[PDB]
Design an enzyme around this catalytic site. Structure first.
Site, mmCIF file in Angstrom:
data_model
loop_
_atom_site.group_PDB
_atom_site.id
_atom_site.type_symbol
_atom_site.label_atom_id
_atom_site.label_comp_id
_atom_site.label_asym_id
_atom_site.label_seq_id
_atom_site.Cartn_x
_atom_site.Cartn_y
_atom_site.Cartn_z
ATOM 1 N N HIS A 107 4.965 -4.290 3.653
ATOM 2 C CA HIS A 107 4.672 -2.870 3.355
ATOM 3 C C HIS A 107 5.963 -2.080 3.189
ATOM 4 O O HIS A 107 6.311 -1.270 4.073
ATOM 5 C CB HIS A 107 3.756 -2.272 4.424
ATOM 6 C CG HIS A 107 3.170 -0.975 4.026
ATOM 7 N ND1 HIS A 107 1.893 -0.640 4.416
ATOM 8 C CD2 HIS A 107 3.623 0.049 3.268
ATOM 9 C CE1 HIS A 107 1.594 0.549 3.896
ATOM 10 N NE2 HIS A 107 2.655 1.031 3.230
ATOM 11 N N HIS A 131 8.364 0.455 0.942
ATOM 12 C CA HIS A 131 8.588 1.418 -0.145
ATOM 13 C C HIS A 131 10.057 1.293 -0.543
ATOM 14 O O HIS A 131 10.902 1.524 0.306
ATOM 15 C CB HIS A 131 8.252 2.816 0.315
ATOM 16 C CG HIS A 131 6.816 2.977 0.635
ATOM 17 N ND1 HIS A 131 5.951 3.687 -0.205
ATOM 18 C CD2 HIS A 131 6.077 2.517 1.653
ATOM 19 C CE1 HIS A 131 4.732 3.655 0.315
ATOM 20 N NE2 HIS A 131 4.774 2.966 1.475
ATOM 21 N N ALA A 182 5.336 7.938 -1.768
ATOM 22 C CA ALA A 182 3.966 7.875 -1.188
ATOM 23 C C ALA A 182 3.403 6.453 -1.166
ATOM 24 O O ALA A 182 2.642 6.155 -0.254
ATOM 25 C CB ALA A 182 3.051 8.803 -1.929
ATOM 26 N N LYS A 210 -0.975 -2.881 -5.345
ATOM 27 C CA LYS A 210 -1.296 -1.928 -4.298
ATOM 28 C C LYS A 210 -2.300 -0.919 -4.823
ATOM 29 O O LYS A 210 -2.049 -0.261 -5.818
ATOM 30 C CB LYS A 210 -0.047 -1.172 -3.846
ATOM 31 C CG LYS A 210 -0.307 0.014 -2.904
ATOM 32 C CD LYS A 210 -0.825 -0.369 -1.539
ATOM 33 C CE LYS A 210 -0.868 0.809 -0.558
ATOM 34 N NZ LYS A 210 0.474 1.323 -0.288
ATOM 35 N N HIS A 234 -3.829 2.516 -3.706
ATOM 36 C CA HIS A 234 -3.488 3.659 -2.839
ATOM 37 C C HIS A 234 -4.343 4.867 -3.199
ATOM 38 O O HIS A 234 -4.477 5.233 -4.383
ATOM 39 C CB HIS A 234 -2.023 4.032 -3.001
ATOM 40 C CG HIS A 234 -1.478 4.845 -1.889
ATOM 41 N ND1 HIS A 234 -1.838 6.173 -1.684
ATOM 42 C CD2 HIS A 234 -0.585 4.522 -0.922
ATOM 43 C CE1 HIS A 234 -1.178 6.618 -0.615
ATOM 44 N NE2 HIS A 234 -0.412 5.603 -0.129
ATOM 45 N N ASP A 241 -3.542 7.867 -3.203
ATOM 46 C CA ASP A 241 -2.880 8.921 -3.980
ATOM 47 C C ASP A 241 -2.961 8.649 -5.489
ATOM 48 O O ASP A 241 -2.679 9.559 -6.244
ATOM 49 C CB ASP A 241 -1.428 9.082 -3.563
ATOM 50 C CG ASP A 241 -1.215 9.655 -2.173
ATOM 51 O OD1 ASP A 241 -2.185 9.824 -1.399
ATOM 52 O OD2 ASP A 241 -0.023 9.916 -1.882
ATOM 53 N N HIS A 284 -4.702 0.844 0.656
ATOM 54 C CA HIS A 284 -4.702 2.114 1.401
ATOM 55 C C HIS A 284 -5.904 2.884 0.862
ATOM 56 O O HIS A 284 -5.867 3.316 -0.308
ATOM 57 C CB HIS A 284 -3.340 2.816 1.233
ATOM 58 C CG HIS A 284 -3.290 4.223 1.737
ATOM 59 N ND1 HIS A 284 -2.178 4.734 2.417
ATOM 60 C CD2 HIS A 284 -4.174 5.260 1.624
ATOM 61 C CE1 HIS A 284 -2.370 6.018 2.669
ATOM 62 N NE2 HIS A 284 -3.607 6.367 2.231
ATOM 63 N N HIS A 344 -1.931 -0.699 7.167
ATOM 64 C CA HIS A 344 -2.052 0.263 8.297
ATOM 65 C C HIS A 344 -3.527 0.400 8.694
ATOM 66 O O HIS A 344 -4.086 1.484 8.593
ATOM 67 C CB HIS A 344 -1.381 1.609 7.994
ATOM 68 C CG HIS A 344 -1.557 2.125 6.608
ATOM 69 N ND1 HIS A 344 -2.809 2.389 6.081
ATOM 70 C CD2 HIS A 344 -0.648 2.410 5.640
ATOM 71 C CE1 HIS A 344 -2.649 2.843 4.825
ATOM 72 N NE2 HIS A 344 -1.316 2.835 4.517
ATOM 73 N N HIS A 362 2.392 16.333 4.205
ATOM 74 C CA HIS A 362 1.321 16.824 3.290
ATOM 75 C C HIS A 362 1.383 18.333 3.034
ATOM 76 O O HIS A 362 0.417 18.847 2.427
ATOM 77 C CB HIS A 362 -0.040 16.431 3.872
ATOM 78 C CG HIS A 362 -0.298 14.972 3.703
ATOM 79 N ND1 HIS A 362 -1.400 14.482 3.030
ATOM 80 C CD2 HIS A 362 0.445 13.896 4.066
ATOM 81 C CE1 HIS A 362 -1.350 13.157 3.017
ATOM 82 N NE2 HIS A 362 -0.215 12.776 3.632
ATOM 83 N N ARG A 366 -7.458 12.217 11.157
ATOM 84 C CA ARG A 366 -6.610 11.069 10.735
ATOM 85 C C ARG A 366 -5.733 10.536 11.877
ATOM 86 O O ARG A 366 -5.487 9.310 11.907
ATOM 87 C CB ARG A 366 -5.774 11.438 9.501
ATOM 88 C CG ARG A 366 -4.873 10.290 9.052
ATOM 89 C CD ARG A 366 -4.370 10.437 7.644
ATOM 90 N NE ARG A 366 -3.179 9.631 7.433
ATOM 91 C CZ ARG A 366 -2.529 9.554 6.283
ATOM 92 N NH1 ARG A 366 -3.011 10.167 5.212
ATOM 93 N NH2 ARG A 366 -1.404 8.863 6.199
ATOM 94 N N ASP A 368 6.024 0.038 6.559
ATOM 95 C CA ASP A 368 5.807 1.287 5.791
ATOM 96 C C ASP A 368 7.150 1.990 5.601
ATOM 97 O O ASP A 368 7.209 3.237 5.587
ATOM 98 C CB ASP A 368 4.745 2.185 6.424
ATOM 99 C CG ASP A 368 3.843 2.870 5.436
ATOM 100 O OD1 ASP A 368 4.266 3.018 4.272
ATOM 101 O OD2 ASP A 368 2.679 3.204 5.818
ATOM 102 N N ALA A 410 8.152 5.703 4.069
ATOM 103 C CA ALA A 410 6.958 6.474 3.637
ATOM 104 C C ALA A 410 6.205 6.949 4.880
ATOM 105 O O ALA A 410 5.839 8.140 4.938
ATOM 106 C CB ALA A 410 6.070 5.674 2.719
HETATM 107 NI NI NI Z 1 -0.522 3.849 3.011
HETATM 108 NI NI NI Z 2 3.032 2.938 2.568
HETATM 109 O O LIG Z 3 1.448 3.898 3.598
#
Ligand code: NI
Ligand code: NI
Ligand SMILES: [O-]
Ligand code: NI
Ligand code: NI
Ligand SMILES: [O-]
Lengths: 100, 570, 122, 570, 100, 100
Positions: D137, D139, D170, D220, D222, D224, D249, D275, D323, D339, D363, D366
């Site tokens: 994971h 970024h 992200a 991936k 995600h 977003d 995700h 995650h 965010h 969350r 992660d 990110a």
């Molecule tokens: Ni994620």
């Molecule tokens: Ni991530």
């Molecule tokens: O993430």
């Protein structure tokens, strides 16, 4: 902080000056890089204080004297140069024969 | 449903009629137009618009009008305008300026600006985006100078040198075929665009021309190699045959001629006059009169920019120390006094404001600061607004006319002068994606992100060990565009047509993108965007007083500048 | 004359979003036991099955809210939302696979919605 | 002649039945078996055994059963066992685990572990040796993240990004053929193994599949980019055809579905749930129920690992800031509260201990720490021993069962999930020689030496100007395996079968070793070593209480961790 | 010492904070990077002292006030973020609007 | 100044020692890198003062005691080594078991 390359390098000069000032405070005669560091940091801090280039050209000749440094160090240092941000932007200071 | 303008600008960046302060200056830019459709703004994140079946198209392959990269909600500051748009990049080039997203569901989408599976997103809402700076007076002395330049938004270095050799420490010159080949190979590891100047000196054509055929992008005439009528003439004969630019640092000493002799040798041919004010070099005291002529592309270097209370003390001492001059030798003092002149430095501020000096440049590490071309451009514009008022051409209380005049000096005008504006120098469709994002509070001081060929090369970013990228220390760092073989695809080596035709890149194993220098010999002052004024500049030989249209050009030095002690740790 | 570096001086006035498009108000209920948040640009008929509303009134529409914002439904919450019309070609592909073409195919969208248990198909 | 056990362990490292404390934790590992012949231990130095005609064979050429490298007297900690052996490396691969030396004069020499003229020696006596960590994971945001990862014993980075672009900040996504090609070229300069994920989003197959053909190693999904039923479905159709893994995700917002909708779209196909506890993303509040399913390969990211007294305050604020959420907007506070849940973070500690969550990951940059995957694995195991006691499966008062369960989470299980366990993820014959030496006092905190493809890439080593390498300052430094062209031979770029068949490495000029991703679609939870438990995980939608086998899973947060303030300067 | 990359970088923040504190002690109004450095180093030293993330979120708003810094500096600093090793491992501290 | 690579690196040790000394002054028990930094900087400053290698091998065992450092730190530090310029050039100092 947004440090640029020069800001990162010039932190080193301040650090070397602090080291050298501690050595002078415990009674050592300073060596070539110590002396250069002290005078250089003095110039950069003087710019930060808002002194003029002309004031620092004068003051930089009175920061260390011959009896603060090892034999030959005065004659090794012909010039010390520093650039710093004055209130009117970056300027170059050259201190000639800083230690007589 | 309606959004108040304060909330709109906070969410999407400013729109039409909104103004933004440039750093801590008193310069305001106003959004002239906006390509968006209100309600269909692009944005990226959790529950945001650029998602599959929504603002991201889920149908089209990359070839089908899909972008590699969308910069959302950019405030563009460019010679072409000050306006709000999305910027689309593909294959390393700007392919669309307009409105990005998904034609499935959005109105007003620019047809080649589809956000698709293949598209990366950079949020530019609340950022100012400019072209990368084009520095045409670079001494290649210390490779540490590249990050210095990138941190202040410079993306192209034109100049010369082999490292800290005396010829290079004095002159923007990489001399002869072998030094040129060596420095083209060195350039494979420099994360910035590069063009190399050869030595503009000789009395026979072949020694000069072989440098162009070896891969030089231009020539530099410098007094320290003899800025004689012969060297000037041969260099311009070579340049006219080869279609490359010639930069000149003229005979300060007036040894073989006065300014009129240098102009006679030039004989109406196109030339780039470096540090035209003359503290950085040239016929004492009247070199700056070059900037009135139609065949002269005139640039300033940056340490005289702008005229401040420390400038003269700093420059007189710098000149004496550099040239090993003695304060007790009257010829040495006379020389320094003839070269460092408040009368011409003050006039240089005003000539920039009037569009008579077309370009800025650094003189990096020879008599100029690699990371202060953009910085000092805006400090000059701010000083001129304070002392001369808004220019007559302004409207709505904005400084847009001044902002386009000044941004042109370090983006498009150097690119035009060098014959590289087909590739770089402005935010226009069809040009290389060299883009600089600025937070307005840091505008012209410290770049946020520097994009090179559509990949981020340099960024102000924090702790690499942190959960997120913003924790301290935030400092300028090289990004993935500089790593491994990607440094080849994100940067251009600019070369002469003849070196390209003769296969120099293959011969030397250059993997960088190769840019062609062209259309350098046809141009003049009239081609300098927003800075196209020709006029008779009179410099009084007794008083050094500068006159244009019978008026003395003078202004005071300032004690303080913006973009200075609020920002810098040293 | 206090200087805030990089500050805005916004113009007067207000920005009207989705100007000239038909607006529709509908009641929507989260019949599930977990929260549902709905973005500005999702084809409204294709939201979570457990949102109960007149599914026909979501076809060819999205929320009339600022771009990049979302409406939140807590478990069991019923509230009114305002929709606006999709623009461009008025086509939807993917998301919940209810449309995959023109939003004009209301009969087909509702048949797929009903077969898959999207609540509120009459 | 007999040697007491204390002196034996001081000279050769521990032997059968001896225990070693892991750093300053209360975890003890016990030597299960030892491949040596007592009296014929290998060692190197003045008057030591590995000398010509003695423990070094002077007869055999390199091809004749001779090693390139022998690690002497290693305490191996691996999913395969905790045991004492010599490790032999040849052609960059582990070729022998057993007993090295010279069959001329020594008993028990493993036949392909001859120390000969060609053999380098690393002394591993008194060291713990593990496989390099496999972080799935990542970024790609800041290249400075690579040394961070190497310093904590990570040798493989799987993920995505183009640098500090919002899509990359992200999501672990390198989108589309062009960004993938650019980042494969960038990878030529990164001194770590790499695999790149494309964007798992689209409603047509071709835009997704072209990323796999371009050289992506996986996808991936995600939220977003829209974690919709369509994007999930198309990504898994592509993955099943291409034999690559998909990471998810999921839709935190429950916008297009609840967890059951995402599972229906997956339709029993293999997927890696990132995650899985959900603070890092996923269906609020019940995403962690994914970890009960047989077709889910579940990983944690590291900032929730383990549950501490600062975790909730830190995570709630981080989520709001990231965010751009406002403390005075009730929808924003409700989202954050839905969350970031102590109930699911506490349960995540226990699910790791029970073998229900199979993997750790970072992660990196990110919402996770590039250099703390190994660190926080061991902090979690230590906390669980303190709170839950030795696991039932333990014997001899050792923590070997827990140690194999936890080491598997960041070595073999991510490698199996990604389809790369034929190359990396464990200390086994036939696998790439990615090995990490640890002093037990620094175990899981700071690696001593990181071996990449049989050459040291990274080491804690001192003053380069000193007479010897140990004087201060001792810090993490890149070693010769990272320099010049050796960076190509010591690192693997993992790619899809189709990109390899289509000649992408030759097309892009990649010189790194090319690894094939394979056998990703056949596997499930049962294939996760020591972490193979399937069960019905109930998450109460009102209280967020987690139940397994009718029992609430809860534990307290701790005020202090080992592997923390004793070691770190900041 | 076994310094990792972050430990080496974060020494710079402490150094910049020491520099800035000397500038404040001789009467200067501090600039943007100075102010950021002081507050950042305060957070990292507070973690080392064993304070909680919540304590540092509070305290970080009272380290420098408007009259310690140049015009515009309060409005330039929206957030200061630092990660440091607390007794319970690395945590992120964000100080919002540290200087009102 | 003409800094060589080692001079630049060793400035870091002085800096880490200053940081650690501030932490000790406000009452903290020092950790592994702090303790190493303090003893290392002590050795390098002692060389600069003109002490002998033998004097520093002795003194380095009395800079920090068990009650200055966290549990286990004495047993983590077997040796501290530093090279510095003595009056007679660079020499290596090893301090064995500096903290009993
Ligand atoms: Ni994620
Ligand atoms: Ni991530
Ligand atoms: O993430
Ligand atoms: Ni010049
Ligand atoms: Ni020059
Ligand atoms: O120059």
């Amino acid at each position: 902080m947004h440090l640029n390359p020069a800001e990162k390098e010039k932190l080193q000069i301040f650090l070397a000056s602090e080291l050298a000032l501690k050595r002078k405070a415990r009674g050592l005669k300073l060596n070539y890089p110590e002396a250069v560091a002290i005078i250089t940091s003095f110039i950069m801090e003087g710019a930060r204080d808002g002194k003029t280039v002309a004031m620092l050209m004068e003051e930089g000749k009175h920061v260390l004297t011959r009896d603060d440094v090892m034999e030959g160090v005065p004659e090794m240092i012909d010039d010390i140069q520093a650039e710093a941000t004055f209130p009117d932007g970056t300027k170059l200071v050259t201190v000639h024969n800083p230690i007589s | 449903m309606k959004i108040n303008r304060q909330q709109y600008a906070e969410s999407y960046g400013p729109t039409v009629g909104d103004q933004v302060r440039l750093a801590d200056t008193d310069l305001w830019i106003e959004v002239e137009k906006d390509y968006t459709t209100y309600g269909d703004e692009a944005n990226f994140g959790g529950g945001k618009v650029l998602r599959e079946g929504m603002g991201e198209n889920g149908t089209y392959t990359r070839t089908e009008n899909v972008l590699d990269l969308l910069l959302t909600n950019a405030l563009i500051l460019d010679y072409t305008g000050i306006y709000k748009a999305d910027i689309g990049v593909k294959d390393g080039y700007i392919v669309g300026i307009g409105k990005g997203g998904n034609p499935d569901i959005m109105d007003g989408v620019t047809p080649n600006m589809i956000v698709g599976t293949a598209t990366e997103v950079i949020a530019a809402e609340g950022k100012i985006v400019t072209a990368g700076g084009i520095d045409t007076h670079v001494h290649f002395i210390n490779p540490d100078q590249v990050d210095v330049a990138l941190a202040n938004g410079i993306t192209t270095l034109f100049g010369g040198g082999t490292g800290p050799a005396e010829g290079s420490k004095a002159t923007t010159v990489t001399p002869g075929p072998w030094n040129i080949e060596k420095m083209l190979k060195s350039t494979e590891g420099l994360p910035i665009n590069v063009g190399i100047l050869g030595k503009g000196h000789g009395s026979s054509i072949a020694p000069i021309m072989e440098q162009i055929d070896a891969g030089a992008a231009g020539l530099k005439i410098h007094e320290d190699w003899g800025a004689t009528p012969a060297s000037i003439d041969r260099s311009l004969t070579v340049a006219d045959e080869a279609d490359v630019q010639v930069a000149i640092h003229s005979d300060t000493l007036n040894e073989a001629g006065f300014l009129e002799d240098t102009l006679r040798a030039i004989n109406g041919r196109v030339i780039h006059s470096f540090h035209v004010e003359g503290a950085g070099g040239g016929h004492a005291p009247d070199i700056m009169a070059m900037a009135g002529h139609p065949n002269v592309l005139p640039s300033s270097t940056n340490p005289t920019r702008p005229f401040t209370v420390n400038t003269i003390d700093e420059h007189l001492d710098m000149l004496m120390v550099c040239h090993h001059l003695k304060q007790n030798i009257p010829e040495d003092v006379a020389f320094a006094d003839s070269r460092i002149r408040p009368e011409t430095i003050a006039a240089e501020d005003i000539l920039h404001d009037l569009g008579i000096i077309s370009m800025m440049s650094t003189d990096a590490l020879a008599m100029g600061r690699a990371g202060e071309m953009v910085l000092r451009t805006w400090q000059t514009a701010d000083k001129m607004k304070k002392q001369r008022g808004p220019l007559a051409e302004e409207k709505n209380g904005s400084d847009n006319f001044r902002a386009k005049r000044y941004v042109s000096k370090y983006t498009i005008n150097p690119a035009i002068a060098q014959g590289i504006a087909h590739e770089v120098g402005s935010i226009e469709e069809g040009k290389f994606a060299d883009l600089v994002l600025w937070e307005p509070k840091f505008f012209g001081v410290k770049a946020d992100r520097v994009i090179k060929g559509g990949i981020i090369a340099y960024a102000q970013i924090g702790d690499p060990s942190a959960s997120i990228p913003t924790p301290q220390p935030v400092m300028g760092r090289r990004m993935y565009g500089t790593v491994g073989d990607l440094i080849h695809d994100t940067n251009i080596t600019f070369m002469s047509k003849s070196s390209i035709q003769q296969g120099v890149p293959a011969k030397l194993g250059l993997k960088r993108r190769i840019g062609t220098v062209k259309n350098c010999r046809n141009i003049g002052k009239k081609d300098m965007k927003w800075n196209d004024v020709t006029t008779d500049i009179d410099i009084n030989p007794e008083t050094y007083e500068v006159k244009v249209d019978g008026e003395v050009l003078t202004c005071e030095p300032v004690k303080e500048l913006p973009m200075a002690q609020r920002y810098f740790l040293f | 004359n206090y200087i805030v570096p990089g500050e805005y001086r916004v113009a007067e006035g207000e920005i009207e979003i989705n100007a000239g498009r038909e607006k529709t108000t509908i009641r929507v209920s989260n019949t599930g036991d977990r929260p549902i948040q709905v973005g500005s640009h999702i084809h409204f008929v294709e939201v979570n099955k457990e949102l109960l509303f007149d599914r026909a009134e979501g076809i060819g529409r999205r929320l009339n809210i600022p771009s990049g914002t979302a409406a939140r439904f807590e478990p069991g919450e019923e509230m009114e939302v305002e929709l606006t019309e999709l623009g461009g070609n008025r086509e939807v592909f993917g998301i919940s696979d209810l449309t995959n073409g023109s939003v004009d195919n209301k009969e087909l969208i509702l048949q797929r919605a009903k077969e898959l248990g999207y609540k509120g198909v009459e």
